[PDB]
């Protein structure tokens, strides 16, 4: 329909009023903007002058009636927090919003037996009335017809789930910065949405008032500085740092030597003029890297000047230290897509759902008066439009995977424009893909650049145990990766200084024998360390300390380690070697940004230690290699060796599906239980690996050869145990099996003590395995090994957040949870006094 | 429950889990079930020198999760560090 948009008349004798009208408003009542012009007929060339007194207030009055629901009042401090009314997210608001911006993701549609999510662009819908209220104050004086939206950003808060239909969301906004630049005034606003008291996401809008502003008394700027690292090598570097009045440790006598320091500093600055600050502050914690790589607060930066030309704190850290960068670029960008989108014919539908009733997007006259090329598309529309493409093509239509999104508005888009977005995967950041984009119009002009932070797909890391190890493993990565270098070296230094061998030497060269020499002052210390290694058992409520290496006394000059084929295959060196290459791989991943913040993880046997060391940083590198060395030594003493260092123990992988389809895993458990009782030797099932395809039986190398022969016999004769034990006889099959076992036990006992094990039909012997891992043979080793773990897993390094529902122990294949129900489950497998005591006293611990 | 008491209980449970793991069978059937079915994992990355656990996952998928992967229309990648490093580091060949 046809409505009055501009009314021009004389108000007084010499004052022309051009009332501009907006007829698209919050409540339907049209809003007037009276522009006033003096008419001076003495000056014929230019008889009309604009009334410039309170002109920016008149414009703010109009926009306040369009945007803000409140009573008009521009006396509030920009420094103060702005609080927005609570917004309930309804299905109708999400439907209306998604159809406006063209977001066809299934996550935002109502489905049966499913809950409707709200898009994260819907954050501006909730936040607009708070965020925009920050450019209105008297002290942020600016022509609001000349207001550019420079950039907009969302950042999901870590842990926080995305917005759902039915959530009540509280906004608060605050001005981060407001600075006079030569070309006009910038205003950085930082919204924070909040559901049920916890904060959910952060909206960061920046606006730009074009003009000339000299009111520097009202400008200020908060900046979060990039984290800075300093390696303290010399007592010179300590002395320079103690010089600086702003460097303030909590304890003045703290030993900074060889420590790594991080400086997490915020700068606050007021201005006096264009380049001289009237006040600087640079405050923030100083943290020290511990051996677990966990940073802990040991002091503060606390610089505070008046009239300065610079922040000296930052300039110090820029030179002396090094910028820690969360974003790691990939080697080469990976193109994702190059997608077409269209801007809509009209800007009313977006204006209705967003609440952004800026007349420049809908009224021709206002857009003409503002010198714009026409009724320009909303910047926020183009944002939400492209965010819908990124979400479809980078996130594969899973809205929950978009955790960040920032777009710079470069240029103004007209309605019915064709836009071409290129989308690249350009980097990583804390296990989130870092996707750049650029949207160009028909004239191939850049209109909208930005970046998104897309979560990777649900990832689990698994860490291999023993059997895998091979000469030269991890060494390619050792030559290239700075993070692998730091792992291997830290461990190799700790072995050299303590046990007088290099773990690196053993992995590169795999020597058959290794002799440790106890000459000199250095070798006396090393020999003490090989005698200080003890089993702290508890027998009749009394500590009995036994010695590992009982053939190392006060009078020993050497000690020799002996293997048959190589010392990399000797558990006490395998375990540290194989834990280190895993920990170094993983540290290379973590340096390259590739480790999700909520990745699950699990280790097969030994891997558990590398997994806990990698993902949960429970032990340092030095504590870890100590623990697995001791663990490998605790296993080598329980097994009698000969002169070459070969035992009468090993492991067979058994495929029950290769022997016979009918022959189940309970048939294999039955046979092995029988062969362990008839012969009277040791054999159990230890690794349940792949269901009815790969079980692993550890035990007495003869008993293994009888099992291999029994199952090689049962295949060829084609005689099932499960059909015969039920449908034919009761315990006759037991006595019929005992003579099959005896046939194999008479052929295996005649062979010499260190018999080579042969590849059966349903049984393959594992290479480089001489210990019965995970058997009941090693039960006597638990008591001392447990007491050793308590000394070396410090309770202060057990972050529960990093294990809880993420780590799956081998013992109890259920995600780690600190609950009575979980402790009970752990007690029902391994009857331990300390676990029982925790279960029974659960209530006292609960409060 | 206070953080500092959760920390102490976690430390005790973690020490007891490692301690007994030494000399108790490895339930890797059940562990696979958890990370493959309960968490619907789409990237199993094996850290290690040989693809032995990546072997075991691929065989445990092909055996008892062929019909469940097709139904829920999910694509599992089973990547070993020592083979599939180009897929782990996002450095594909031009
Ligand atoms: C046993 C193991 C070597 C098999 O892995 P792999 O070398 O990839 O073997 P594959 O399944 O590809 O089979 C290779 C061949 O070996 C033989 N084989 C494999 N498993 C066998 C079994 N259980 N019984 C008999 N022969 C077997 C077959 O001849 C097979 O030929 P195919 O290709 O026709 O099937 C490996 O899974 C392993 O080392 N597992 C043990 C891990 C472990 O327990 N570590 C911790 C120790 S506490």
Exposed, middle or buried by CB within 10 Å (0-12, 13-18, 19+), for A692? Answer: middle
The one-character DSSP state at A568 is G
Hey, which residues of A are catalytic here? 605
Q: Which atom of ligand 1 is nearest to the CA of A693?
A: 23
Which of B1, B26, B60 is opposite residue A687, by nearest beta carbon?
B26
Q: What is the SS3 string spanning chain B? A: CCHHHHHHHHHHHHHHHHHHHCCCCEEHHHHHHHHHHHCCCCEEEEECCCCHHHHHHHHHHHHHCHHHHHHCCCCCEEEECCCCHHHHCCCCCC
Helix A701-717 vs helix A665-678: crossing angle, to nearest 10: 130
User: What is the number of residues in chain A?
Assistant: 847
Tokens representing residue A513 in the block: 């024998």
DSSP letters spanning A199-261? EEEEEEEEEEEES----GGG-EEEEEPPPEEEE--SHHHHHHHHH-TTEEESSTT---TT-EE
Q: Which CATH class is domain A53-211+327-456?
A: alpha beta
Farthest-apart Cα atoms in chain B, separation: 54
Question: What is the CB-side half-sphere exposure of residue A234 using CA atoms within 13 A?
Answer: 5
d(CA A120, CA A388): 10
A122: left (phi over 0), alpha (psi -120 to 50) or beta: alpha
d(CA A52, CA A212): 14
CATH assignment of B1-93, among 3.90.25.70, 3.75.10.10, 3.90.1150.10, 3.40.50.300: 3.90.25.70
CATH of span A512-565: 6.10.60.10
Q: Does any ligand 1 atom lie closer than 6 A to the CB of residue A605?
A: yes
Q: Does any ligand 1 atom lie closer than 6 A to the CB of residue B55?
A: yes
Residue A803: its chain B contacts at CB < 8 A? Answer: 10, 14
Tokens representing residue A801 in the block: 């957040």
d(CA B12, CA B10): 5
CB A120 within 8 A of CB A126: no
Q: Is B61 on the interface with A (CB under 8 A)?
A: no
3-state helix, strand, coil in chain A (%, to 5): 35, 30, 35
User: What is the number of residues in chain B?
Assistant: 94
Residue B46: closest CA among A604, A619, A814, A628: A604
* Resolved by: cryo-EM
Q: Is B44 on the interface with A (CB under 8 A)?
A: yes
- Secondary structure E strands in A97-240: 147-156, 168-181, 184-195, 198-210, 220-224, 228-231
Nearest CA to ligand 1 atom 44: A687
Relative to beta strand A600-603, strand A459-463 is parallel
Residue A584: closest CA among A494, A705, A478, A741: A478
d(CA A68, CA A63): 8
B13: left (phi over 0), alpha (psi -120 to 50) or beta: alpha
Tokens representing residue A766 in the block: 């594992």
CB A366 within 8 A of CB A351: no
A810-847 topology per CATH: Helix Hairpins (6.10.140)
**Resolution to one decimal, Å:** 2.8
CATH of span A641-768: 3.30.70.3330
Alpha-carbon distance values, A720 to A372, A661, A666, A761 (Å): 87, 9, 12, 16
Residue A193: closest CA among A172, A166, A174: A172
Q: Does any ligand 1 atom lie closer than 6 A to the CB of residue A658?
A: yes
The one-character DSSP state at A777 is G
d(CA B13, CA A682): 30
* A813: phi then psi, degrees, rounded to nearest 5: -80, 65
Q: Does any ligand 1 atom lie closer than 6 A to the CB of residue A466?
A: yes
- Helix H or strand E encompassing A835: helix A833-840
Relative to beta strand A277-289, strand A459-463 is unpaired
* 3-state secondary structure at position A428: strand
Which of B26, B59, B81 is opposite residue A688, by nearest beta carbon?
B26
Residue reference for tokens 């710079």 = A408
Looking at CA atoms only, how far is residue A779 from chain B in angstroms? 5
- In the sheet that A31-39 helps form, which strands lie side by side, from edge to edge? A6-12, A15-22, A31-39, A48-50
Task: Pick from A602, A653, A770 the residue to mutate for probing ligand 1's pocket: most ligand atoms within 8 Å of its CB.
Answer: A653
Mutation for A interface: B27, B50, B78, most A CBs within 10 A: B27
Q: Which atom of ligand 1 is nearest to the CA of A694?
A: 23
Looking at CA atoms only, how far is residue A417 from chain B in angstroms? 33
Looking at CA atoms only, how far is residue A774 from chain B in angstroms? 4
Q: Does any ligand 1 atom lie closer than 6 A to the CB of residue A656?
A: no
Domain ranges of chain B: 1-93
- Secondary structure E strands in A464-590: 513-517, 534-538, 543-547, 558-562
A212-326 topology per CATH: Lipocalin (2.40.128)
Helices (H), A420-509: 475-480, 482-499, 503-509
Which of A465, A782, A795 is opposite residue B23, by nearest beta carbon?
A782
Exposed, middle or buried by CB within 10 Å (0-12, 13-18, 19+), for A114? Answer: exposed
Question: What is the CB-side half-sphere exposure of residue A128 using CA atoms within 13 A?
Answer: 20
- CA A549, A552, A553, A555: dihedral to nearest 10 degrees? 180
């Amino acid at each position: 329909e046809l409505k009055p948009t501009v009314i021009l008349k004389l108000l007084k004798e010499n004052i022309i009023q051009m009332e501009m009208i907006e007829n698209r408003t919050m409540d339907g009542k049209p809003v007037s903007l009276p522009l006033l012009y003096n008419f001076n007929p003495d000056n014929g060339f230019a008889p009309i002058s604009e009334v410039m007194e309170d002109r920016n207030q008149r414009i703010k009055e109009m926009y306040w009636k369009l945007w803000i629901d409140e009573p008009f009042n521009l006396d509030f401090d920009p420094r103060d927090v702005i609080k927005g009314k609570d917004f309930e997210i309804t299905a109708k608001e999400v439907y209306d919003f998604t159809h406006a911006v063209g977001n066809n993701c299934e996550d935002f549609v109502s489905r049966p037996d499913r809950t409707m999510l709200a898009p994260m662009d819907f954050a501006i819908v909730v936040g607009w009335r708070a965020i925009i209220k920050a450019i209105f104050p008297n002290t942020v004086d600016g022509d609001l017809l000349k207001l550019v939206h420079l950039s907009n950003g969302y950042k999901m808060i870590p842990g926080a789930k995305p917005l759902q239909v039915g959530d009540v969301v509280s906004t608060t906004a605050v001005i981060e910065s407001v600075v006079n630049q030569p070309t006009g005034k910038i205003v950085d606003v930082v919204g924070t949405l909040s559901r049920n008291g916890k904060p959910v996401m952060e909206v960061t809008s920046s606006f730009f008032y074009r003009g000339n502003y000299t009111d520097f008394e009202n400008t200020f700027q908060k900046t979060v500085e990039p984290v800075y690292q300093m390696h303290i090598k010399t007592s010179k570097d300590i002395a320079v740092l103690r010089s600086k009045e702003w460097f303030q440790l909590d304890d003045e006598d703290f030993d900074l030597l060889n420590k790594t320091l991080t400086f997490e500093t915020e700068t606050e600055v007021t201005f006096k003029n264009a380049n001289i600050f009237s006040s600087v502050k640079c405050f923030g914690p100083i943290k020290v890297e511990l051996p677990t790589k966990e940073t802990v607060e040991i002091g503060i930066v606390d610089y505070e000047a008046g009239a300065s030309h610079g922040n000296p704190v930052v300039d110090f850290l820029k030179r002396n230290g090094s910028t820690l960068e969360q974003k790691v670029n990939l080697e080469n960008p990976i193109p994702i897509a190059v997608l077409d989108s269209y801007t809509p014919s009209t800007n009313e539908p977006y204006a209705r759902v967003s609440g952004d009733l800026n007349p420049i997007h809908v009224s021709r006259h206002f857009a003409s008066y503002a010198n714009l090329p026409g009724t320009i598309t909303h910047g926020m529309f183009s944002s939400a439009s492209v965010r819908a493409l990124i979400e479809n093509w980078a996130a594969d239509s899973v809205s929950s995977r978009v955790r960040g999104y920032t777009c710079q508005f470069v240029d103004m888009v007209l309605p019915n424009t064709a836009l071409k977005t290129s989308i690249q995967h350009v980097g990583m950041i804390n296990g989130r893909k870092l996707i750049k984009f650029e949207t160009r119009n028909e004239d191939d002009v850049v209109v909208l650049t930005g970046e998104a932070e897309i979560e990777q797909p649900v990832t689990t890391f698994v860490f291999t145990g023993q059997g895998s190890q091979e000469q030269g493993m991890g060494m390619d990565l050792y030559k290239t990766s700075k993070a692998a270098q730091d792992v291997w070296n830290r461990a190799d230094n700790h072995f050299k200084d303590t046990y007088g061998f290099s773990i690196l030497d053993i992995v590169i060269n795999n020597p058959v024998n290794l002799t440790i020499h106890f000459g000199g002052e250095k070798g006396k210390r090393i020999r003490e360390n090989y005698s200080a290694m003890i089993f702290e058992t508890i027998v009749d409520g009394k500590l009995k300390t036994e010695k590992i290496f009982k053939e190392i006394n006060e009078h020993s000059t050497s000690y020799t380690f002996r293997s048959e084929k190589g010392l990399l295959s000797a558990t006490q060196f395998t375990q540290p070697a194989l834990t280190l290459m895993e920990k170094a791989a993983f540290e290379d991943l973590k340096s390259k940004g590739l480790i999700p913040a909520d990745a699950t993880f699990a280790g097969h046997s030994l891997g558990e230690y590398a997994a806990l060391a990698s993902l949960a940083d429970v032990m340092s590198i030095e504590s870890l290699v100590e623990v697995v060395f001791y663990r490998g030594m605790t296993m080598q003493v329980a097994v009698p060796r000969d002169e070459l260092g070969r035992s009468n123990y090993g492991m067979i992988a058994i495929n029950p599906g290769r022997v016979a389809a009918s022959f189940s895993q309970e048939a294999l458990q039955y046979v092995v239980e029988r062969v362990g009782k008839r012969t009277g030797w040791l054999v159990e099932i230890v690794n349940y690996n792949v269901e009815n395809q790969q079980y692993v039986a550890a035990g007495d190398l003869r008993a293994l050869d009888t099992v291999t022969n029994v199952l090689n016999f049962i295949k060829l004769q084609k005689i099932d145990i499960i059909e015969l034990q039920k449908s034919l006889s009761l315990e006759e099959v037991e006595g019929h099996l005992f003579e099959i076992i005896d046939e194999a036990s008479k052929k295996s006992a005649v062979k010499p003590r260190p018999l080579k094990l042969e590849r059966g039909f349903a049984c393959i012997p594992l290479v480089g395995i001489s210990v019965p891992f995970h058997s009941t043979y090693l039960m006597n080793g638990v008591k001392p090994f447990k007491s050793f773990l308590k000394k070396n897993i410090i309770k202060e390094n057990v972050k529960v957040a990093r294990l809880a529902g993420k780590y799956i122990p081998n013992l109890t294949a259920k995600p780690f949870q600190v609950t009575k129900e979980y402790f009970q489950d752990v007690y029902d497998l391994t009857g331990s006094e300390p676990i029982k005591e925790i279960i029974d006293n659960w209530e006292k611990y609960e409060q | 429950m206070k953080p500092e008491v959760e920390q102490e209980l976690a430390h005790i449970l973690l020490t007891e889990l490692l301690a007994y793991q030494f000399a108790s069978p490895v339930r890797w059937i059940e562990t696979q079930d958890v990370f493959l079915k309960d968490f619907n994992t789409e990237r199993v990355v094996e850290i290690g020198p040989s693809p032995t656990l990546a072997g075991m996952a691929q065989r445990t998928l092909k055996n008892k999760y062929e019909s469940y992967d097709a139904a829920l229309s999910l694509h599992r990648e089973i990547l070993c560090y020592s083979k599939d490093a180009k897929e782990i580091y996002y450095t594909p060949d031009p």
